[PDB]
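[SOLVED] Need 3D model of a four-part complex

Original post:
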Amino acid sequence: CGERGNEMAEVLMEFPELYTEMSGTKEPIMKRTTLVANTSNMPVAAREASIYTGITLAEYFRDQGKNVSMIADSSSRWAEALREISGRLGEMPADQGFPAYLGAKLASFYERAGKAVALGSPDRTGSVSIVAAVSPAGGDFSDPVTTATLGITQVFWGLDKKLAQRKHFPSINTSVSYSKYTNVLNKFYDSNYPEFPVLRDRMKEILSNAEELEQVVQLVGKSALSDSDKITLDVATLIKEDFLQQNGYSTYDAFCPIWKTFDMMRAFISYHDEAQKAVANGANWSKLADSTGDVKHAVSSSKFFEPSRGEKEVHGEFEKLLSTMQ
Amino acid sequence: CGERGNEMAEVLMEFPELYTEMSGTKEPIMKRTTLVANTSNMPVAAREASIYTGITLAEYFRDQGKNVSMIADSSSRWAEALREISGRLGEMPADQGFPAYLGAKLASFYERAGKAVALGSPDRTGSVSIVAAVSPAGGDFSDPVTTATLGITQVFWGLDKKLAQRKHFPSINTSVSYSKYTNVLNKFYDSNYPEFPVLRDRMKEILSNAEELEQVVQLVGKSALSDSDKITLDVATLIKEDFLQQNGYSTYDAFCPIWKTFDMMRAFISYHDEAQKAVANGANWSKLADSTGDVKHAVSSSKFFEPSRGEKEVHGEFEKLLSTMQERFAESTD
Amino acid sequence: GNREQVFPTRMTLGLMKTKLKGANQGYSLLKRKSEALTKRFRDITKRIDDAKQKMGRVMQTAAFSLAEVSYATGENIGYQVQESVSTARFKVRARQENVSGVYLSQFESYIDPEINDFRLTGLGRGGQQVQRAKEIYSRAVETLVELASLQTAFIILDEVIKVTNRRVNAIEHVIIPRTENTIAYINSELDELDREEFYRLKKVQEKKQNETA
Amino acid sequence: EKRTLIAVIADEDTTTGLLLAGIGQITPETQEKNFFVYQEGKTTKEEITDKFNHFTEERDDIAILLINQHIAENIRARVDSFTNAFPAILEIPSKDHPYDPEKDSVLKRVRKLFG
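Solution:
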C-alpha cells in the first residue's frame, strides 16, 4: 500500500526462485503467495482499496481452511490516503490532519484478523494473521497512526534506526517491543519446549540489565564495574551480535527454525550461568575471558550452522557445545 | 531595517568625520554612502520596502561600474515584518509563524548580489555584495530566517554570545563560521600574498587542535598532555587573544589592512613553528616559555602597530620582529 | 547554560534522559568506589608509617651490626662479601591484589638460595660471625620488601583516587549539568513545535468550519 | 615474573654485608651490580644522582631501590622529584644517622595528605 514499485518487482522476481517444502516438495513460495501492488506514484485513493483487497483475500483463503498471513506494507500510507481524502473532503481534521474516524477504520481492518471456524461444511478452521508495517513521520512513535495501531495490535516489533545504521539486523528495539501472545503460547511451549518461556524471560532480563549498564559504562568506564556487571555486559553483547543479529540475506541466517532458536538460546543462557557461577565462587572475569575465549567463540559461531542439515544434526550442539564446555 | 534610530544617528555623526583614500585624496566616506532607515518603531510594513529600496540603489550603482556593498541590518526584521503582515492576513503559518514564502523571498533578494557587466555601453563591470545581519530568536541558529539565509549565502560569519559577553570581539565562532570563496580567492593571493592561504589553513588547524585539546582538558585537566599539546593550546590562546580579537574602537585596530593581517599571521605561525621545533629538539616547554615570554609579548603586541605608519614601515618592523624571534628561540634552546 | 549541540526530537529527548540517568548512577558508583579506596588509603598510610618506624629501629639494631669482622670474627675484611658477586636472591615477586576493586602491583617475599654465599666458611671468620648477616639481615630485607609493598600500594592507590575524584567532579559539575541543559532545551523546542502544530491545526479547523460549512 | 631485582645504594657496611648474604650483588648477565660503593667524600654527588637515574630509570629489572640517608640528603631534589611506582625507593638509616621521619620523600607525601 503506497510503497516502491521495485519492491513489488523484487517479490515477483525472488518468490518464484524461492521454494517451500511445506507441501512435501519444493514449490515456489510465489505459488502460494499473491500480490496487491499499489505503489506511491499510483492513485492515493487506491491505497485504501489495496488494504481491503488484501484482508478480503486472506479471509477468503481462511474460509478454505488455510492459515493465511496478510503482510500490509505500509498501514501509514492508507492512513495518509484517508487524511488526503478527508482534507479534500471538508470535514474537521484531527490531531495531525487525520480524520476523527482513523482509529475506527484501523480497528475495523485489524478486527478482520483471527483464528476462526469457517462457515459451511466440511468443518474446517483457518486463520488470518496481519503484519502491518507503520512508517511514523520522522521515526516518532507518538504519531496518530502508530498510537492507534499500538492500541489495536497485540504484537509490537518496534524497529531502531541506530541499530539499522550499524547493519544490526533485524533492528528490533527490545526495550519497547512487546508481545501479548506470550501467555497463550505457554501451552505450545509446554508441549514442545518447556524451557522456552523461562529462557526468553532470562534473556529479556539480561538485555535490560545490559541496556541500563552500558549507559553507565559509556561515562565511567568498564573497569569501574563489578565482575558480575562486566559478565552481564559481555553476555548481552554476545547475545546482540550473535543471537539477536541475523543476516536475512545469507544461507545460514535467511531462516532460523524454532529448534535452532531454542538451542542457541539455551547455549547463550548456559554460558551466562557458567560465567556468573565461576565469578560467584571466586574468579577473575578479566582472565577467565581469555581462558574461555574459545568456548565463547563456539557459542558465537553457533549462528553459522546451516539449517539444511535439519534437526538432530545441528542438535549436535547439545553436546559439541554444551558439553565441550559448561 | 527594523533597528535602533540611534544606530542611524551615530552613522550620520561619524561617517562625515571618517576619510577614505579610494579616490587618491582624503574625502569623507559619507560622500559615498547612502542610508535607508526604517527604525524598529517605524511602520513595520515599510521594512520590506526599505530592503527592496536598498538593493535597488545598490544595483543602480553597480550599473555604473562601481563596487557596492549593501548592508541589511537586519534581515530578520524584514522577515518579522512579513510574518506580521501574514498574521494580519490570516495566512497559514510556516515554521515559527513565518509565511511559507519567506525562503523564496530571501533567495530572490540574495540573488540580486553579484559581479556583473553593466547593461549598456561603454563596457563596465560592477558588483553588489550583500552583507546581512541575522537576529535569530533567542540566539538560536535554528531560526527559520537563519536556516534559509545559510542555505542562500556563501559566507557564514557566525557570532558567539559567550565570546561577546567576554568582550572578545569580533565574536566569530571559528568552529561554525565558513567561507566558500576561499577557493576563488587563491588567484588574488597568488598575485599579492602567495602564502596567505597556507597560513590561513595553518591557523585554522591550530585552532581546531586547540578546541579538541580543550575538550580533553575540561574533563581530564592539563596533565598527560605532551609539550606539543601544551604549545598548541598556548599558541591557540595567543591567536584568540591577539589575532582573532580586534578592538574596533581603537586607533590601531579600527582597521587592519590585508598586509598587516598577513604579517601578523606570519608572526604567529612563526612563533608556533619555532616553539614546536625547539621542543621537538629536546627543549622543555615550561622553561622555554619562561625564557621567551619576551618574544611572546612582542608577538602579542604586534597588533598595536599603527597601520597609518604605512605598509613599508610596518612590514619592516614585522621583519625585525621575525628576526628577533628567531634569534631568541635559538638562544633559549642552545 | 552550556548544552550539547543536538537537534530537538523526542528520540533525542529520550536519549538524553537515558544519558542523564546513566550519569547519575555512574556518579554514585564512582562515589562509592572513591570512598572505598579512601578508606583503604587511610589504612595504608597508617601501616606505612608503622612499617617505616619498625624498619628504622630494626635495620640499625640487627642488620647493620654484622659481625663478620673484625674483632667479633676471624677476619677483618669490610667488603669480603662483595667479592662473591653472583645472581641476585632475596628477591620479591610483585603480586596483583584486589585492593578495592582495582588491582595493585604490591610485592611478596620470594627469596631464593642464590649462589649460597656466606660471611664465613671461607671468609676467615667462623659461623657465629655470619649469624647477623645470615639471619637478622635476611629478616631486615624481608621487612624492607614488605614495606615496599606498602610504598607501591600507596602510590598506585593515590593515583587511582585522584583520577576517580577528578572524574566524579567532572560528572557532577560538567556532564550532568550539560545533559540537564540539553534536556531542558529539547523539551522547550519540542513544546514550541507542538504549540505551532496545534495552533496551525486550530486555524485550519476554524477556517474550514466558519467559512466552508 | 617481570621485575624482581633488589638495588642497594649504601656504604660497604650494608651493600657488601648484611642483606648481601642472601640478596647477592650481581645481575644474571650484567656487571653493574645494581649498587654503588658511595665512598665517603669520594663519589661525586652528580655521580650519585647519575647512579640513582641508572637504577631507577635507565634499567627496568630493578624492583626496589634501597638507598641510605647519606646519598638521599644530598640527592634530595632528585628523589623528591621522582614520582613513579615500580622502583619503590626506600630510605634507610646508615652508620649513626637514624631514620629522621621528617626528611624522606614518601613519608613527606604521607603527612602532606591526609596525615
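Edit: DSSP finds 14 helices and seven strands in chain A.
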